[PDB]
Amino acid sequence: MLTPGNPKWERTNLTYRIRNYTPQLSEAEVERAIKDAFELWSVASPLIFTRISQGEADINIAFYQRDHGDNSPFDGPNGILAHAFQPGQGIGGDAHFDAEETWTNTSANYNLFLVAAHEFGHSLGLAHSSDPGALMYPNYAFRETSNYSLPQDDIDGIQAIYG
Ligand SMILES: O=P(O)(O)C(NS(=O)(=O)c1ccc(-c2ccccc2)cc1)P(=O)(O)O
Ligand SMILES: [Ca+2]
Ligand SMILES: [Ca+2]
Ligand SMILES: [Zn+2]
Ligand SMILES: [Zn+2]
């Protein structure tokens, strides 16, 4: 449980698609950040994420600037980094990233893998944690990524929804 209304996916093998990229990183680096972000949740649950290259996926990932069609505009550099929709059809599950950020795979603001991993919590039905060590805490902070695994609070959360 946790996002109000307990929205959750009805099946556990979900597809994803990366619709576009960011000039800040190579295409492979974005693919890797996203893949590894999904795998964080997969190893703590029965969820299995399968990538498609084109067409209709459960979870769309894209980089957009300012107004981008969903009435939740981005805000330029810094501030809002990304957002994601609760499980559901259509825009449900989808994760958008502010294309005006410096996106990294380093300690420098902002690490794409960490932001994506947080947003995918929302895509799967988690709200914010009050545990300051949780991935689902409301404010971004860098932590070491080379061997990263979900903080225990986030494991508690995904298990509460999906086992
Ligand atoms: O401005 P929004 O309310 O859409 C938030 N987006 S955000 O860009 O302010 C944001 C995104 C990721 C994080 C984050 C937190 C912990 C670790 C990594 C990233 C924090 C804030 P949300 O997706 O968390 O509800
Ligand atoms: Ca921004
Ligand atoms: Ca969707
Ligand atoms: Zn959006
Ligand atoms: Zn959040």
Residue numbers in the entry: 80 to 242
Tell me, in the authors' exact words, what the paper reports:
Matrix metalloproteinases (MMPs) are a family of 23 enzymes that control extracellular matrix (ECM) remodeling and act as key regulators of cancer-bone interactions in skeletal malignancy.
In order to obtain detailed structural information on the binding mode of the bisphosphonate group, we tried to acquire the crystal structure of MMP-9 in a complex with the inhibitor ML 115. Meanwhile, the second phosphonate group is oriented towards the solvent. The sulfonamide moiety is hydrogen-bonded with the backbone NH of Leu160 and the backbone NH and CO of Ala161 belonging to the antiparallel β-strand of MMP–8. As expected, the biphenyl group is inserted into the S1’ site. The obtained binding pose overlaps very well with a prior potent phosphonic sulfonamide with nanomolar potency towards MMPs.
